[PDB]
Write a protein that binds this ligand. Structure first.
Ligand code: HEM
Length: 422
């Protein structure tokens, strides 16, 4: 993948290198001090040039000026300030019911197939789960993709994704159809929501709540669709990929798995539901998930606009330049991580110095992932429940490896046979 080329040029040509990404030129910056400087300061903002191909796609607007697309600091801080509320400790804690429900449903579906012969795309399974969690926790809707439902909606997302890929690398407008379908799904849910809140009905505190709250005084509900499609995608795709990677990797780490089983047996035993309080105790699982994001971050990095020509690690960089930051790249440099290709959870063990600006799967600073804790909670619940109940062996001819689509994800879907643990 392209990221591997950047890795090689970073190792070979130093901490500051000019490259072509998405057919614009920019400078990839791979020193931790530069990461700190540019990401930990409100002075530096996203580069609208890089994000415009995501703002709109093949004529149909997609993410618009959503919470991710929006580059202007002030328009952004307005949205963020209110959407933050849907992510407070109390909000997250009230999500445990949704996470538990969906994870249990997944484990049940999978146990039904666990004869050691039926192959299963863990990639697909993990995606339906992530989408079901997101759809309910964010918008209060049941999609039931784990149970065969909303197949069209599933296809839209699928194509809408391939679309974005092409939209920004191409050296079949089902895509435009899809982008529209998605936006209409949004219109419908936003609607079902208003229609219930004008039956004066008691609806609890969602992400959806806050996005509407932030689109007040808006002549159109077009920015409200922006945010809808934004969370709808941001909120399931990278989590599903993160899951898929972790499972791909674990299938060839029997020792790691043993220690994880051991751990989950103690912390949760055989209870069906994890309590919010249990998550904190899943120390070692948490290390595994970190080491997974280091080698396989679904979101490889971010861009910032350098406006004043500045000096960067002894290199004059011209003003108006897109700076590229890559956690994928840094994760794989022997300069920052000893023996980088080796998957080792102890890197994050208690007592190890935390990586210092060389690891940022959720990015850093004011534009960091608003959903970080949400995703870390969700991901522990699903992994815990898998570890508690199943064993996964990978089917022959499945490659370990990676592809650079809209985000990084496993090269092959992750085909496995399953046995009940025992
Ligand atoms: C393991 C999963 C996830 C990873 C690795 C991840 C990663 C990050 C990263 C690297 C960005 C991009 C920063 C940039 O483009 O400069 C991002 C932004 C963001 N993420 Fe996630 N994310 C994950 C899950 C979530 C979830 C579950 C949600 C939604 C509930 C979400 C919502 C967003 C949003 C809205 C932003 C933009 C925030 C802002 O600029 O204010 N993410 N995240």
């Amino acid at each position: 993948v392209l990221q591997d080329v950047f890795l090689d040029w970073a190792k070979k040509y130093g901490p500051v290198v000019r490259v072509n990404v998405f057919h614009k030129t920019s400078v990839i910056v791979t020193s931790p001090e530069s990461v700190k400087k540019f990401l930990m300061s409100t002075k530096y903002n996203k580069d609208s040039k890089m994000y415009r191909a995501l703002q709109t796609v093949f004529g149909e607007r997609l993410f618009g000026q959503g919470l991710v697309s929006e580059c202007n600091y002030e328009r952004w801080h307005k949205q963020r300030r209110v959407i933050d509320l849907a992510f407070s400790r109390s909000s997250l804690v009230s999500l445990m019911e949704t996470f538990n429900e969906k994870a249990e449903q997944l484990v049940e579906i999978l146990e039904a197939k666990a004869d050691g012969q039926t192959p299963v795309s863990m990639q697909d399974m993990l995606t339906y789960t992530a989408m079901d969690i997101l759809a309910k926790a964010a918008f209060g809707m049941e999609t039931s993709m784990l149970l065969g439902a909303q197949k069209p909606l599933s296809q839209a997302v699928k194509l809408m994704l391939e679309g974005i890929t092409a939209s920004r690398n191409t050296l079949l407008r089902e895509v435009r159809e899809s982008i529209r379908f998605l936006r209409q799904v949004g219109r419908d849910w936003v609607q079902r929501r208003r229609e219930a809140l004008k039956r004066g009905e008691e609806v609890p505190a969602d992400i959806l709540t806050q996005i509407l709250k932030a689109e007040e005084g808006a002549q159109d509900d077009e920015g409200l669709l922006d945010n809808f499609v934004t969370f709808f995608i941001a909120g399931h795709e990278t989590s599903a990929n993160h899951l898929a990677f972790t499972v791909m990797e674990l299938s060839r780490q029997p020792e790691i798995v043993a220690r994880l089983q051991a751990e989950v047996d103690e912390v949760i035993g055989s209870k069906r539901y994890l309590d919010f309080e249990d998550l904190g105790r899943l120390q070692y699982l948490s290390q595994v998930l970190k080491e997974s994001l280091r080698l396989y971050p679904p979101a490889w990095g971010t861009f910032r606009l350098l406006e004043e020509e500045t000096l960067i690690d002894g290199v004059r960089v011209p003003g108006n330049t897109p700076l590229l930051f890559s956690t994928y790249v840094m994760g794989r440099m022997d300069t920052y991580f000893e023996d980088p290709l080796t998957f080792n959870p102890d890197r994050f063990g208690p007592g190890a110095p935390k990586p210092r600006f060389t690891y940022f799967p959720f990015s850093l600073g004011h534009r960091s992932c608003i959903g970080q804790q949400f995703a870390q909670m969700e991901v522990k619940v699903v992994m815990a429940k898998l570890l508690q109940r199943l064993e996964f062996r990978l089917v022959p001819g499945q490659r370990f490896g990676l592809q650079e689509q809209a985000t990084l994800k496993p090269l092959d879907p992750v085909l496995c046979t399953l046995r009940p643990r025992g």
